[PDB]
Design a binder for this molecule. Structure first.
Ligand code: CDL
Ligand code: 8Q1
Ligand code: SF4
Ligand code: SF4
Lengths: 44, 198, 172, 113, 218, 157, 49, 39, 126
């Protein structure tokens, strides 16, 4: 079943590390990082 | 029909003075059941449906009418059997049908009501099912059913300052009048109809 | 009363008052009300031709009370006088006076009220709605009529008049 | 003898289900039996559904959360859809390049002799 | 008709590494961070968490004090999307993609000998949903079954294609012409003259399309 | 020993805190009930109390009483909320509670409608049903024999 | 009276007012209300006047 | 027969406000009844 | 060509999503506007996206007795919201557009010959 992992229907499964890294983000958003940076920078 | 199905016999168990006439066909969905309901009990039956436990989760999907007076079997006339629903069309002036869907029972329930009085009187249920308002307005205007105790009887989908029931089999598709522009009156007017016959 | 005809649906006479400092009143019979008509409940069923006739008379009374406002807004006063329009609609009702079915009469009264409301609210056009008010056999008052047919066929039967007029194009 | 059914029996005909147990006012146990049957149907009809109802889904909700610029990235399935599409395109391109040419239909006026 | 099923549940595909069809990169730890946000009553309803945290304070301050819309969206759309080539097709000097199945302007064809392919069977007239085709036929002096009047009301006709589908000899064909704008309503009352002229003018392309259409079943 | 439908409402038995509740109902603006068993019991007892206005022989009353008895017995037997939900379909218990609460209002509607009595139009409905079941034949298929010669009559004298 | 009817009583709850004042449907009329002998508007009986 | 327990129109409602919830949860706590809510 | 369109449709979805989904003005315009419960959904016969925005979980394609095409034998997902407002409806429409790509991909794969004859000697496709 395509909606679940490791389904036989999936075809692009071998050696997709580089392709996935290029296509999708490699970063996670910290909740208050932008807020703290912008506010402190604005005050100073 | 490889599903779990049960007849909606609750209505006729509760309304103990009514006789049951129910159908299911492969022409319909597996969970679809038709029944005959008298007009004088239609309103009370809808009251029971709208607030019974298992019928509480019921929505009025559709409502319309059929001009059964001019209904004739054009082919396979002899194959008709006394159990077929078509037997109730003959000689009856109108047949108004409602269709509901119930979520608890995952079922579809259609009710057929035969109108034999010439004025086509029947109690409205738009006070029980809100969406029935415009459905009944359309049915009344297009077929001339005189709904009683209806929230709003004003026409819906018909032209202004005109009275007619086009969906009746007597009416002609070309209509009875055409709207043109009159220079003498400098405005749109309506006059008698002349059309093209293929 | 929560209805289009309710006594509280009047148009205020002032921004800060209703027609007076010691009283509250407004006109809603000879003109359209303040709030639009959101719902028009069906006429309560009439079990008797007496009730049906009363409904017809009350509807005609409302139409007569409203006709001058309709004429003024639609600019059709020249075509016919208020009384002429009343008499023409009376003839319209007379043609239907043979009804003897209370349910049909109730349905007709509902339709009449609906069309009257449309005329009040300008939903209909004057040329489209004047067909009900037009005289049955009298010329329109805003036009010059032609009496050529009457002069030609004076003191002749309607059959002969129709025979000479014809009822089909002669080209084909 | 004549109508082939007992006077107590309420069933004129039951082609729908051929039920042999009538529901009548006199036999009050018929009402209880019908109620039990109705609740049995209410349970079983919902049980047989594949997507409409699921107690497991009710007690373990699965949500889709918009958290990145690419809405496909938020779902593992949609990322795989993108990858499969690109894989199919690459496979088609490889096959065609290996073949080296493409046959095509050429109009011929002599077809209309 | 229906089928019987014994196992309602569609079990998940095997997750073992040794088994074939195993995708080692299906799940990304950086991206699949749903579990962190899954337990949030705000997502499930109107209620609020028991204990609010300063993260909400920082997020609200960022959203309100420094309105990020006018910068985030302005950049992402105005500055970036403007770098894509225009999608416009210069109609006067270029045409959009069409297909041989395109239904444009009706026309009447002829055999290669010059004889009309139209025999007055009226199948097209009957199939015309809009009653836009009028046909009257009289025997020709040589004896051929040929129409004397074949009119198509282009204003009354819906370009469905039923006429060419029902034609048994490919007489009436809805050729590819679509630039048939008319200034007078009478110019849209196509007659047999107009249809035959259209067929004579557009036979090459119509024949080219018909070749491919006929060869497809083969 | 006493029937559940005759026993007085037992607040202590039912109105107790319950763990393992759903985090959300899955429907918008449908909060989670903390005491589904208590709500079902209260609704059932109120419905039974209000049914006494309907005649005892009424099939509506019989049907409603049997349904309420079945629901109460099942709820008393099954303390686990998840098991109770599995029995009552497989949807949220809150939706079932909301649907069940409407019978309190339905009781008065049915009392006024009086489904156990006969309306005047039942005879007309029966006539319509009877006529709808008649055998029908067509003139086209009816045999017609050639009539015999008409005997010419002459006035006497 | 509003709290008895169930209206919002807090600022944060003011945003769901429509769900408690307007969304709730009105109970349909009892069928006994369709059987009244007469439907004329009520007026004081002027007997003895 | 025993008098049925009082049931108000508020209880039959699908969702509850603060004052409506307070009467029902009287003698208990929101965490105790509905469980702890995270964010 | 349909597969190529499906691949490129993610770009258009993301372009719209970037300017609409997270925009403060868009959220303030839609969120908590037009809110309605299941009962409204039920009373007025609301269906499809309008119904699913209430969480009714009503889809005719994934119904045992009401499926009408290959849908019942495809593994796709239908989405519902816990808030019955315009914002939830917009999100549902976007997700349904995205999931139509997956359904189309599955449908096209159902008529595809992925495997091929493999030579015994070389173990390569012929
Ligand atoms: C004269 C000619 C001029 C020609 C001009 C031509 C036009 C130029 C246009 C330029 C436009 C600006 C650039 C836009 C880039 C967009 C990139 C993008 O898509 O990502 C967005 C990105 C965030 O999105 P994302 O990273 O995808 O988010 C996902 C993350 O996973 C989420 O992760 P997270 O949320 O956890 O954190 C992510 C965060 C990263 O956060 C962090 O990592 C912060 C960590 C610190 C937290 C605070 C703690 C304290 C830290 C400091 C401590 C110091 C003391 C330490 C003491 C120690 C003691 C022991 O990302 C950010 O940085 C967001 C902050 C936004 C800043 C806004 C920048 C406005 C630029 C305006 C430019 C205007 C130019 C006008 C024209 C020129 C002048 C006239 O935001 C940016 O980075 C914005 C750009 C920042 C500047 C980089 C470029 C600088 C150079 C610009 C040169 C311009 C050309 C001309 C120069 C002059 C030539 C002569
Ligand atoms: C502003 C434009 C409005 C245009 C409205 C057009 C639509 C009109 C709708 C139809 C109105 C009708 O025909 S309503 C048809 C009403 N039915 C009857 O009148 C039959 C019973 N008649 C009687 O009781 C009397 O004859 C009576 C003549 C009433 C008094 O006569 P007097 O006691 O002798
Ligand atoms: S295109 Fe369709 S509607 Fe138009 S003439 Fe041909 S068959 Fe008739
Ligand atoms: S165009 Fe074709 S279908 Fe129409 S009359 Fe001629 S031969 Fe028959």
């Amino acid at each position: 079943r395509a909606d679940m992992a490791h389904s036989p229907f999936h075809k692009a499964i071998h050696d997709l590390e580089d392709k996935r890294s290029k296509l999708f983000p490699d970063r996670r958003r910290i909740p208050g990082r932008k807020a703290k940076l912008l506010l402190a920078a604005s005050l100073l | 029909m490889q599903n779990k199905y049960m007849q909606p016999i609750q209505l006729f168990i509760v309304f103990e003075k009514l006789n049951s006439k129910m159908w299911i066909s492969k022409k319909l969905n597996s969970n679809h059941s038709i029944a005959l309901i008298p007009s004088n009990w239609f309103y009370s039956i809808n009251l029971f449906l709208k607030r019974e436990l298992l019928f509480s989760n019921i929505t009025l999907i559709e409502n319309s009418a059929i001009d059964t007076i001019s209904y004739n079997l054009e082919t396979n006339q002899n194959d008709l059997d006394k159990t077929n629903i078509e037997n109730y069309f003959f000689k009856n002036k109108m047949l108004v049908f409602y269709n509901y869907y119930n979520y608890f029972l995952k079922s579809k329930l259609t009710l057929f009501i035969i109108l034999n009085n010439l004025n086509k009187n029947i109690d409205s249920i738009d006070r029980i099912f809100a969406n029935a308002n415009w459905l009944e307005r359309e049915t009344s205007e297009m077929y001339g059913i005189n709904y009683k105790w209806k929230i709003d009887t004003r026409k819906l989908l018909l032209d202004y300052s005109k009275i007619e029931n086009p969906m009746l089999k007597e009416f002609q598709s070309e209509g009875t009048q055409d709207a043109f522009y009159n220079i003498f009156e400098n405005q749109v007017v309506v006059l008698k109809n002349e059309t093209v016959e293929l | 009363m929560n209805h289009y005809w309710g006594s509280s649906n009047t148009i205020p006479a002032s921004s800060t008052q209703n027609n007076n400092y010691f009283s509250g009143g407004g006109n809603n019979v000879t003109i359209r009300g303040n709030e639009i008509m959101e719902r028009l409940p069906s006429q309560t069923p009439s079990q008797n031709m007496v009730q049906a006739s009363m409904k017809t008379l009350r509807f005609y009374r409302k139409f007569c009370r409203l006709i001058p406002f309709i004429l003024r807004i639609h600019n059709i006063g020249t075509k016919f006088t208020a009384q002429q329009a009343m008499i023409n609609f009376g003839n319209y009702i007379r043609e239907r006076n043979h009804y003897r079915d209370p349910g049909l009469i109730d349905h007709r009264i509902q339709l009449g009220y609906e069309l009257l409301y449309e005329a009040e609210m300008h939903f209909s056009q004057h040329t489209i709605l004047m067909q009900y008010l037009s005289p049955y056999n009298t010329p329109l008052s805003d036009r010059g009529y032609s009496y050529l047919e009457k002069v030609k066929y004076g003191n002749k039967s309607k059959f002969l008049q129709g025979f000479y007029k014809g009822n089909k194009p002669t080209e084909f | 003898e004549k109508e082939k059914r007992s006077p107590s029996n309420n069933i004129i005909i039951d082609e729908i289900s051929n039920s042999d147990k009538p529901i009548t006012k006199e036999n009050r146990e018929s009402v209880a039996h019908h109620v039990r049957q109705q609740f049995e149907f209410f349970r079983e009809v919902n049980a047989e559904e594949v997507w409409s109802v699921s107690i497991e889904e009710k007690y373990n909700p699965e949500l889709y959360i918009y958290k990145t610029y690419d809405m496909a990235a938020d779902d593992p399935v949609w990322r795989q859809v993108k990858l499969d599409l690109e894989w199919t395109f690459e496979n088609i391109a490889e096959r065609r390049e290996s073949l080296g040419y493409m046959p095509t239909f050429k109009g011929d006026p002599n077809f209309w002799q | 008709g229906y089928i019987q099923r014994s196992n309602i549940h569609e079990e998940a595909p095997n997750t073992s590494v040794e088994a074939k069809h195993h995708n080692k990169t299906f799940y990304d730890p950086i991206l699949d961070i749903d579990e962190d946000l899954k337990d949030d009553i705000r997502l499930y309803g109107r209620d609020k968490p028991d204990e609010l945290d300063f993260t909400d304070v920082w997020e609200s301050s960022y959203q309100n004090i420094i309105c990020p819309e006018y910068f985030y969206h302005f950049w992402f759309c105005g500055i970036v999307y403007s770098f894509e080539p225009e999608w416009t097709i210069n109609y006067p000097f270029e045409k959009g993609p069409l297909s041989p199945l395109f239904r444009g302007e009706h026309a009447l064809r002829r055999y290669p000998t010059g004889e009309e392919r139209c025999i007055a069977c009226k199948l097209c007239q009957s199939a015309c949903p809009a009653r836009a085709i009028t046909i009257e036929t009289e025997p020709r002096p040589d004896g051929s079954r040929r129409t004397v009047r074949y009119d198509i009301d282009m204003t009354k006709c819906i370009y469905c294609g039923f006429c060419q589908e029902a034609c048994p000899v490919d007489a009436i064909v809805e050729g590819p012409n679509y630039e048939q704008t008319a200034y007078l309503h009478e110019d849209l009352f196509y007659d047999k003259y107009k249809l035959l002229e259209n067929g004579d003018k557009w036979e090459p392309q119509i024949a080219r399309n018909i070749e491919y259409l006929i060869n497809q079943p083969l | 020993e006493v029937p559940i439908h005759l026993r007085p409402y037992n607040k202590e038995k039912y109105e107790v805190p319950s763990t393992k509740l759903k985090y959300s109902t899955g429907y918008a603006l449908l909060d989670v009930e903390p005491m589904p068993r208590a709500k079902i019991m209260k609704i059932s007892y109120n419905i039974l109390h209000k049914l006494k206005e309907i005649p005892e022989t009424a099939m509506y009353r019989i049907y409603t009483e049997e349904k309420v008895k079945y629901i109460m017995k099942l709820t008393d037997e099954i303390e686990d909320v998840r098991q109770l939900e599995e029995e009552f379909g497989q949807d949220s218990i809150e939706l079932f509670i909301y649907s069940y609460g409407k019978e309190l209002e339905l009781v008065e509607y049915m009392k006024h409608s009086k489904p156990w009595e006969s309306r005047p139009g039942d005879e007309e409905q029966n006539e319509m049903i009877r006529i709808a079941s008649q055998k029908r034949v067509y003139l086209k298929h009816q045999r017609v024999d050639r009539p015999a010669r008409q005997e010419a009559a002459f006035i006497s004298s | 009276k509003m709290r008895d009817l169930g209206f919002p009583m807090e600022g944060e709850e003011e945003e769901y007012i429509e769900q408690r004042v307007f969304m709730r449907e009105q109970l349909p009329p009892l069928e006994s209300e369709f059987w009244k002998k007469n439907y004329d508007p009520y007026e004081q009986d002027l007997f003895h006047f | 027969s025993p008098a049925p327990p009082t049931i108000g129109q508020v209880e039959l409602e699908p969702f509850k406000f603060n004052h409506e919830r307070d009467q029902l949860i009287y003698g208990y706590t929101m965490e105790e009844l509905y469980g702890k809510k995270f964010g | 060509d349909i597969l190529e369109f499906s691949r490129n449709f993610f770009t258009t979805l993301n372009e719209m999503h970037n300017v609409l989904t997270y925009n403060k003005i868009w959220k303030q315009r839609l969120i908590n506007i037009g809110t309605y419960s299941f009962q409204t959904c039920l009373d007025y016969g609301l269906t499809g996206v309008m119904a699913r925005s209430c969480g009714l979980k009503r889809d005719l394609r994934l119904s045992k007795t009401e499926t009408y095409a290959n849908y019942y034998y495809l593994n796709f997902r239908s989405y519902t919201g816990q808030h019955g407002d315009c914002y939830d409806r917009f999100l549902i429409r976007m997700n349904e557009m995205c999931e139509s790509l997956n359904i189309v991909n599955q449908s096209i794969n159902k008529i595809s010959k992925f495997n091929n004859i493999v030579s015994i000697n070389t173990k390569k496709n012929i």
